[PDB]
Structure 1
């Protein structure tokens, strides 16, 4: 039910690490599965398909001077350190993973990009 939205968000992050970092497609497959698991666990009791923006603040993935703690923990379990994540991911990024819609913004004043929409 939350599968495809979380898959799209994870893939977006995984693609950033591939493109900017040349992180192995092999290592990134493990990372993707790891992060999928972690986000579906985090999101379980906070997903309202009828009100897609309900809980969106909670589900929101934010990166700036502080790394999102879930991304940080999962990347670390997989071989990507936090100094790496700061270097390889965009310096300010926000990712909204909601029922029927995944969107993101790079930079505070970046435009809103829709990634997944059903």
Structure 2
């Protein structure tokens, strides 16, 4: 039903902001909630538990020269600018949020790390 995978993904980003930033828990709670909501809306029509790769490119969260637009706008709601995000988050991040598995990679050549796995 998407909640756990989205929650794990948002929990990861929130943890990066807590550790690297000086961001209050009030703000981190707003950020976590709003991002969970935003991604739930974004992923609604692009979530196929029986085919986890289907929609994987659409759902993937990327940070390059550009910040991911959903992260940017939710971050703005808690008073973080994109320049700040560029500094607080890893610079070459890919975060895949798929049915039964959330994983990520930092840098084009970095390891693939599994954040969340669960059995269908």
TM class, shorter-length? over 0.9
**Shift of residue 79, structure 1, vs aligned partner:** 1.1
Point out the more displaced range, 36-45 or 25-34: 25-34
- 1:61-80 deviations in whole A, cap 9, x for unaligned? 00011100000011111211
Moved over 3 A (4+): none
Structure 1: 5+ residue stretches without partners = none
Residue of structure 2 in register with 1:98 after alignment = 98
Calculate the TM-score normalised by the size of structure 2. Answer: 0.96
SS at match of 1:84: helix
Residue of structure 2 in register with 1:36 after alignment = 36
Distance 1:19 1:25 in 2: 12
Q: CA RMSD in A?
A: 0.7
Q: How many residues align?
A: 118
- 1:14-45 deviations in whole A, cap 9, x for unaligned? 00011111211221011000000000000000
Distance 1:109 1:20 in 2: 23
Structure 2: 5+ residue stretches without partners = none
Calculate the TM-score normalised by the size of structure 1. Answer: 0.98
